Amino acid sequence: YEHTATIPNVVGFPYKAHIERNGFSPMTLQLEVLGTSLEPTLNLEYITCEYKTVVPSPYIKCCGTSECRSMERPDYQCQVYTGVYPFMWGGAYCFCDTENTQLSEAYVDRSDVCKHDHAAAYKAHTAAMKATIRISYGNLNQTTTAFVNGEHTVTVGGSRFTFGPISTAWTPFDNKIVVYKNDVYNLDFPPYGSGQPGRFGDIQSRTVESKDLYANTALKLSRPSSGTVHVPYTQTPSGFKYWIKERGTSLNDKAPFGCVIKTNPVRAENCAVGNIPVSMDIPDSAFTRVIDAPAVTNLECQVAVCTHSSDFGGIATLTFKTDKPGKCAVHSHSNVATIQEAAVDIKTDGKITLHFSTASASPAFKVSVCSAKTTCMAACEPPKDHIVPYGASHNNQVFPDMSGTAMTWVQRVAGGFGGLTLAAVAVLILVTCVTMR
Amino acid sequence: CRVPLARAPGVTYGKRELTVKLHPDHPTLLTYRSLGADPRPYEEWIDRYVERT
Numbered sequence A: 001y002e003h004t005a006t007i008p009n010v011v012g013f014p015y016k017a018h019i020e021r022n023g024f025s026p027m028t029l030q031l032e033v034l035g036t037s038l039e040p041t042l043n044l045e046y047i048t049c050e051y052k053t054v055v056p057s058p059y060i061k062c063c064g065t066s067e068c069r070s071m072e073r074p075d076y077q078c079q080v081y082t083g084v085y086p087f088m089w090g091g092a093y094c095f096c097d098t099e100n101t102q103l104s105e106a107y108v109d110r111s112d113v114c115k116h117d118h119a120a121a122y123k124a125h126t127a128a129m130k131a132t133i134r135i136s137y138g139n140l141n142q143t144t145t146a147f148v149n150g151e152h153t154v155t156v157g158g159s160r161f162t163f164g165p166i167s168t169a170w171t172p173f174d175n176k177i178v179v180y181k182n183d184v185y186n187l188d189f190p191p192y193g194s195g196q197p198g199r200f201g202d203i204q205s206r207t208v209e210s211k212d213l214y215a216n217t218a219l220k221l222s223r224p225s226s227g228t229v230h231v232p233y234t235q236t237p238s239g240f241k242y243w244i245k246e247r248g249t250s251l252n253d254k255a256p257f258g259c260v261i262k263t264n265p266v267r268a269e270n271c272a273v274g275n276i277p278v279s280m281d282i283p284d285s286a287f288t289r290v291i292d293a294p295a296v297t298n299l300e301c302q303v304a305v306c307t308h309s310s311d312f313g314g315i316a317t318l319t320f321k322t323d324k325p326g327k328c329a330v331h332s333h334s335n336v337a338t339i340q341e342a343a344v345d346i347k348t349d350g351k352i353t354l355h356f357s358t359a360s361a362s363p364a365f366k367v368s369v370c371s372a373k374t375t376c377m378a379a380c381e382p383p384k385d386h387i388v389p390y391g392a393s394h395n396n397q398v399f400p401d402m403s404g405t406a407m408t409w410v411q412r413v414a415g416g417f418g419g420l421t422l423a424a425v426a427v428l429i430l431v432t433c434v435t436m437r
Numbered sequence B: 001c002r003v004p005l006a007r008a009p010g011v012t013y014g015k016r017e018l019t020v021k022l023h024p025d026h027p028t029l030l031t032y033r034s035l036g037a038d039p040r041p042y043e044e045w046i047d048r049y050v051e052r053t
């Protein structure tokens, strides 16, 4: 039996979904949403890590002939110097002067903990999101697991459910992101091609297989001082360590809807946005028929105290003549006020207590027993002076009812002030009809 | 890897306003954000006792 419904995407909020098919007793569904999780697509442009400047021991040779050779390792500084007079512990070696060679070379290589201490870049796109939904009805109460994509079944049991697609994907992520040990950032990066010497990503290596470690870290060599053996190389500090040092402003604190990020598959969980449509079909034998416990007769409602707006302050009394006592269904058609009690047992006396809540001081919620329906109104004037630490359990719609009890005098004074000018128009019309002649 | 745990901040809620007293033993960090569409983030290091509204 197909039927459609909508659920606000608010975690921890029980939802009541009423099915009122004829030929059977009307029935109610308890809906729970537990920890949604939006998972994006990842592209893995390149990688960034520390760099080690590998320099071999300098080459000394006292003949004067230079040997300049070029290899394929990154950012060589191929240079050899003359006029060197090196010194060591034993004073000095050799005798010749003004005719000597001093070969100095250095290059760069990836870090030793590159396997573990790396930082990853990723590209985001249209993202799917999974949700865990708990369904309950008469003597059946189970959790589910659905991808809540455009179309997909659940098959919790006798019935079957299909959760519709999200209205809009307001993903906190966007385009390019960085993942590094349990936190992400909405910080853009230079492309894999070229990078600035020092800011960030001065090493733009690809996947961890250590191939073509592109470097633009700008090594520079210089003439060693005349004192002893040297290898003077100038280098800017690693941008990876500096970026870690500055860090700051983690994205986990910038979620526009308080959506906590977990990094193992990189997903965002426990955040409210939009609403989720759903469709369902139910077998005929999943509930009772109309012949069981029809005991509505007449109906009227009363309210004792209606201190509202925090969890539930609307205690209501419903009395009615009863047939053989038994179970039944109860809900409210409108959404200005919401109840918590599911299908409740009915005694022969007929006195039934209900708990509901609302926002406006003049609710017009229309209660509905599994066969009857009567308008219920209350003067829920008194608020309460607190700042609650728990969750709200009603719709945010606050609006005094059209009928109401405190705003009636506004309506009557407006109607009377309109009536003055309406009667003035009437008397003018009669006068002008007299004088038109 | 063990890490310290600061004392519970002293909260004294007003109306549509939240007042808190902070008694730090070492320089720590306090951040807050709003569940609404505009988050309005905030972060600021703390080293001495201070009140924040």
Ligand SMILES: *[C@@H]1O[C@H](CO)[C@@H](O)[C@H](O)[C@H]1NC(C)=O
Pocket (backbone or CB within 6 Å): A030, A136, A141, A142
């Ligand atoms: C469903 O069962 C769980 C026990 O696992 C219980 O805590 C929960 O209240 C039940 N649902 C309802 C609507 O009673």
